[PDB]
């Protein structure tokens, strides 16, 4: 009925420095072109982590830093290379590009802790 984005409150990055989380969205209709962007929020200054465009049922391909798999309205994201400085809030942004209407969805953010 309106756009919603859900993502976990907190995830622990592995010792391998890889963190995974599911980002799922709800839409009034059924989009067929979706663009997913991972943003990093740090004191109102936001940077792009990765982004990918995605036809549903056609697999989600980005790289170098993010991999992703798709399943219905869910996107399983994996972020690799996390060191020490990257602990922070990672926002899932989902743009439903086609068919109209366009929808923008901004998640609440996942606090990724890296050790």
């Amino acid at each position, epitope marked *: 009925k309106a756009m919603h984005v859900a993502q976990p409150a907190v995830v622990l990055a592995s010792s391998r420095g890889i963190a995974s989380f599911v980002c799922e969205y709800a839409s009034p209709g059924k989009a067929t072109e979706v663009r997913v962007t991972v943003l990093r929020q740090a004191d109102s200054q936001v940077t792009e982590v990765c982004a990918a465009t995605y036809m549903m049922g056609n697999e989600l391909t980005f790289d170098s830093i993010c991999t992703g798999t798709s399943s219905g309205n869910q996107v399983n994201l994996t972020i690799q290379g996390l060191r020490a400085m990257d602990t922070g809030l990672y926002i899932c942004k989902v743009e439903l590009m086609y068919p109209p209407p*366009y929808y923008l969805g*901004i998640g609440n953010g996942t606090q990724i802790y890296v050790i």
Partner: antibody, heavy 118, light 109 residues
Framework: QVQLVESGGGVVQPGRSLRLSCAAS????????MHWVRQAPGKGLEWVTF????????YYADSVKGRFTISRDNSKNTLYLQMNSLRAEDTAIYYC???????????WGQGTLVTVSS | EIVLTQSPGTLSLSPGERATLSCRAS???????LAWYQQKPGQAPRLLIY???SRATGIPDRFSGSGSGTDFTLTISRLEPEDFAVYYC?????????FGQGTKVEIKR
């Protein structure tokens, strides 16, 4: 410093065409979606059109659908509005605007006046 | 289309007073998708507030936003001379992007 400089405004007769340009500086142009917004004299703001990062998705307001075309040239850091079949009521200040990564229109050009009249 | 209705049309206030501006939406707008803009005559609009509550960079703290669902408020805690101007709300969560019709904040004398 983020900068959006518009050009191309002026007087055009009804039914004719006119192209506006917006030259962008101070940021990675291809990383942002863009819009045109217009303002008839003494009136409010009306969204005109939206274009995605690489130009593959374009949206239009109903009042201009089938008459206006938005485009962008990412290698020249330039946004365009091609207006066809112009009408008197398209007379307005036209602004380009950048979409912030969190959604709002965070930077605006200073606008150029388009007068449609014979 | 999500219609935004601002009120009042014109606020007449003295400098130094508190200004409260309302924006009502014809259907629910996520708080993450509501912005306020300021416009002075002869100038382009300027982003003030986004995500209903968050100030754009360099916007002074006397400006604050609140609200949710269909009902949003812009507050200016003390009007300075440069704050007398037109204010527009906007939803940017779905197409068509829509604006309120504007509230003019005027000097009362």
């Amino acid at each position: 410093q983020v900068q959006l400089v518009e050009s191309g405004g002026g007087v055009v007769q009804p039914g004719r065409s006119l192209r506006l340009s917006c030259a962008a500086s101070g940021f990675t142009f291809s990383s942002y979606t863009m819009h045109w917004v217009r303002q008839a004299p003494g009136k409010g703001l009306e969204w005109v059109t939206f274009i995605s990062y690489d130009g593959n998705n374009k949206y239009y307001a109903d009042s201009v659908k089938g008459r206006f075309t938005i485009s962008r040239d990412n290698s020249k850091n330039t946004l365009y509005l091609q207006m066809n079949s112009l009408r008197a009521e398209d007379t307005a200040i036209y602004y380009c605007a950048r979409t912030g990564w969190l959604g709002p229109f965070d930077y605006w050009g200073q606008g150029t006046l388009v007068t449609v009249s014979s | 289309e999500i219609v935004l209705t601002q009120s009042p049309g014109t606020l007449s206030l003295s400098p130094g007073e508190r200004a409260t501006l309302s924006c009502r939406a014809s259907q629910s707008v996520g708080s993450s998708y509501l912005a306020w803009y300021q416009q002075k005559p002869g100038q382009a609009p300027r982003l003030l507030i986004y995500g209903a509550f968050s100030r754009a960079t360099g916007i002074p703290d006397r400006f604050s936003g609140s609200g949710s669902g269909t009902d949003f408020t812009l507050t200016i805690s003390r009007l300075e001379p440069e704050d007398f101007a037109v204010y527009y709300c906007q939803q940017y969560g779905s197409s068509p992007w829509t604006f309120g019709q504007g509230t003019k904040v005027e000097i009362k004398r």
